[PDB]
Amino acid sequence: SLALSLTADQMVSALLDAEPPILYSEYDPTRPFSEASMMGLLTNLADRELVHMINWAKRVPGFVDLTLHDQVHLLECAWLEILMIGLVWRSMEHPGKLLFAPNLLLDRNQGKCVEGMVEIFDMLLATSSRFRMMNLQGEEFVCLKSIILLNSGVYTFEEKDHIHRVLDKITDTLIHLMAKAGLTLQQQHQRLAQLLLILSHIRHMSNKGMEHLYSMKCKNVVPLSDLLLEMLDAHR
């Protein structure tokens, strides 16, 4: 159990404390942007973030209880989702902009440099505006990010039952947070629904982002790391 024995407050503390750091990009302001160079920049960043994500996932309660193959599968399915919800979260207080890194703050006009990418920026920006409209809290964010990790690949599978117990427990945690924030009982399940429905949009953005990334790779636009190639190859 262990993961199941935790209280709601202990669940939150563990997740907040497991948060990966904000990384910097290799952005050089001496040179202008090209399609290849921005793709190089964004994927370089994602690759470094992936290493931290992996160590984060192991700190998500119940994840270490899974076999190595299940851990691989869940991360393979959800990695871009997890990156995007993080991106959208830290872009909250930057309306009209996506904070990929502290030294890489991009608006939709700068998305146009890579073909087909401005549509993806627009979706990410809309989600960020939604989180801002809902006034999404950090405690809620880390809960959602964990839910994505455990849920996104859970149906591509008795330990599947273990995952749902953990997922249920995060639900209990979410509600706990809303109740403590003063929300009425009705507002609690309404907000819960609103938050979870966002994950369907995040799934959608990952799928579009995945095929766009695949497109760029197959046009030899950007060299992807061996890790990214392997993460990308898992979706096809």
């Binding site: 290493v51 992996i54 192991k58 190595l68 691989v72 991360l75 393979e76 890790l227 392997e230 993460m231």
Partner: peptide, 10 residues
């Protein structure tokens, strides 16, 4: 083998 598989052990 898979890099992810290796990184999950380190």
């Amino acid at each position: 083998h898979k890099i992810l598989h290796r990184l999950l052990q380190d």
